[PDB]
From a paper:
Of interest was [name] from the thermophilic cyanobacterium [name] (Te), which transitions almost completely between blue light-absorbing Pb and green light-absorbing Pg end states using a phycoviolobilin (PVB) chromophore. In addition to the conventional thioether linkage that connects C522 within the GAF domain to the C31 carbon of the A pyrrole ethylidene side chain, PVB is attached via a second thioether linkage between C494 of the GAF domain and the C10 carbon between the B and C pyrrole rings. The end result is conversion of C10 from sp2 to sp3 hybridization, which shortens the π-conjugation system of PVB and induces the substantial hypsochromic shift from green- to blue-light absorption.
As prior data with other CBCRs demonstrated that full photoconversion requires temperatures above 200 K, we anticipated that the blue light would generate one or more primary photoproducts and not drive rupture of the C494–C10 thioether linkage nor the complete transition to Pg. Indeed, comparisons of diffraction datasets collected at 150 K from a single TePixJ(GAF) crystal as Pb and then after irradiation with intense blue light clearly manifested structural changes at and around the chromophore. Taken together, it appears that blue-light excitation at 150 K allowed isomerization of the chromophore within its binding pocket at the C15 methine bridge, and relaxation of N535 into a new orientation. The binding-pocket side chains on helix α4 also adjusted slightly to the photoproduct, based on small difference peaks at Q526, H523, and C522.
Numbering used by the authors:
A (entry chain B), B (entry chain A): 435 to 584
The structure:
Amino acid sequence: SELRDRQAIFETLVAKGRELLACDRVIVYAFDDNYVGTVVAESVAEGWPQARDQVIEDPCFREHWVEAYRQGRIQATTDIFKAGLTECHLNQLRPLKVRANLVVPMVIDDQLFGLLIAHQASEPRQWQEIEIDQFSELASTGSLVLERLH
Amino acid sequence: SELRDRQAIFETLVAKGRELLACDRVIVYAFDDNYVGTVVAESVAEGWPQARDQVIEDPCFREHWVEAYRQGRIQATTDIFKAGLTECHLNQLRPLKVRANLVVPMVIDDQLFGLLIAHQASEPRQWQEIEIDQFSELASTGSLVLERLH
Ligand SMILES: *[C@H](c1[nH]c(/C=C2\NC(=O)C(CC)=C2C)c(C)c1CCC(=O)O)c1[nH]c(C[C@H]2NC(=O)C(C)=C2[C@@H](*)C)c(C)c1CCC(=O)O
Ligand SMILES: *[C@H](c1[nH]c(/C=C2\NC(=O)C(CC)=C2C)c(C)c1CCC(=O)O)c1[nH]c(C[C@H]2NC(=O)C(C)=C2[C@@H](*)C)c(C)c1CCC(=O)O
Ligand SMILES: [Mg+2]
Ligand SMILES: [Mg+2]
Ligand SMILES: [Mg+2]
Ligand SMILES: [Mg+2]
């Protein structure tokens, strides 16, 4: 089925993503029609909390970032505690132990289906250009495959 | 249908592969149980013969290299005319036009499904570490997608 196909691609991307970056967690954060996000796929190293299946109602995508991510925005943050983020935002990440994150979009037929997100837990991390490129290309490959499958 | 889904992934791999490398041709070369290979997808620049839909039986794989390719072996050849190859080997490449090539494995369910292959047709080409890494990861990503899709 279409949804099973999407899930197979998502599970592939999180597994290869974590292997590529050797980070602590990679997820696909998939959007519903209102851009409420569900963690539909996760690859996480041993010992860290499992975000899989969590529903996170974060309004900043619907309200602020849908267009930029459709246009290919990438956001990389070395230390989430030194990024001017509000407590409301931090409280979404604290239970998952996020200290640094890297966000690339999954754009399928010009629509934002979700985000592929890497986490470094309890440890700041300066994401390097080549890591960002490889992570972005992974998301692009998965998105293009889904475009062609249906 | 596995066959239709297969082609969708292969078309993404060859198109993205040739864009990444800016080379003359990228193909998927898939093995059967005799380890005879068939070119099942191709992206090729203008002016070069279309290698698509060629069955090419090369015994060196089954006789020497299948297990090595399963374990991540590649072939990076800067100039095929300086590799001391036999007339049999040159003969099978002559209709396609191959001056340099990069061969990376596609491993699915711990079996060698085939090879993702890049050709430069009219000049030597020293393949760079970043290119080999990107091309290998493209093949690995596509292989894992197929592994999880069905
Ligand atoms: C925008 C925003 N949210 C997220 C969310 C996540 N990062 C992750 O790693 C995960 C998985 C655990 C999620 C989910 C990101 C990365 C961003 C930044 C987008 C970008 O800059 O490209 C955002 N959301 C909030 C929440 C806050 N604002 C509210 O109105 C309410 C209510 C909130 C609490 C839930 C904030 C502060 C931001 C950043 C500020 C902004 O860009 O508007
Ligand atoms: C091994 C060998 N064959 C190939 C084949 C290809 N290169 C390409 O670009 C394509 C797509 C058009 C194909 C197909 C490669 C890359 C390699 C090297 C493998 C490796 O070392 O990793 C090989 N095959 C032959 C052919 C020759 N030997 C025979 O017994 C008969 C019959 C032949 C004619 C068909 C040769 C000489 C080699 C190299 C020597 C070896 O590895 O055994
Ligand atoms: Mg189907
Ligand atoms: Mg690597
Ligand atoms: Mg489509
Ligand atoms: Mg399978």
